[PDB]
Write a protein that binds this ligand. Structure first.
Ligand SMILES: Nc1nc(N)nc(Nc2cc(S(=O)(=O)O)cc3cc(S(=O)(=O)O)c(/N=N/c4ccccc4S(=O)(=O)O)c(O)c23)n1
Length: 127
């Protein structure tokens, strides 16, 4: 079990970038696959990206992005600081929503929010 907390959100100007952070407590974030989601008022949480626990090469961790943000958002992992980040670029009014980070240990089902075990409270992002 791990507790997650997002930070770095808030009012942002369209065209600019924003770096969101997800900090873990109670356990090592390195033991969990971390995912990012976003939710518009009244809608469901939609999958954004995944960063795996392990590598796919000498330096890179496994990563995956929804087509909606592939190439525009970048997920990264900093286990030493028990944190995982999400660099969001060229933000626009369409990106306004509460962003969440979640965790699980499985290697499948990232798209469905119901497959994730723990969630942060979320951070509002307004552009
Ligand atoms: N090293 C390695 N090599 C290959 N081929 N694949 C992996 N996959 C993976 C390794 C690890 S890890 O812990 O070692 O880092 C985590 C993973 C987490 C998820 S997710 O469901 O949470 O998004 C995942 N989903 N994929 C998909 C989900 C939906 C559609 C397509 C994929 S795909 O397999 O990438 O193509 C993985 O495959 C993972 N890892």
């Amino acid at each position: 079990x791990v507790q997650l907390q997002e930070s770095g959100g808030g009012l942002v100007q369209a065209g600019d970038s924003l770096k969101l952070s997800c900090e873990a407590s109670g356990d090592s974030i390195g033991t969990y696959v971390i995912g990012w989601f976003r939710q518009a008022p009244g809608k469901e949480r939609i999958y954004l990206a995944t960063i795996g626990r392990n590598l796919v090469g000498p330096s890179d961790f496994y990563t995956r992005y929804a087509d909606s943000v592939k190439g525009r958002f970048a997920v990264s992992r900093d286990n030493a600081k028990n944190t995982v980040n999400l660099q969001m670029n060229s933000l626009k009014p369409e990106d306004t929503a509460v962003y969440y980070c979640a965790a699980k240990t499985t290697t499948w089902g990232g798209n469905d929010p119901n497959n994730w075990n723990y969630w942060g409270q979320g951070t509002q992002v307004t552009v």
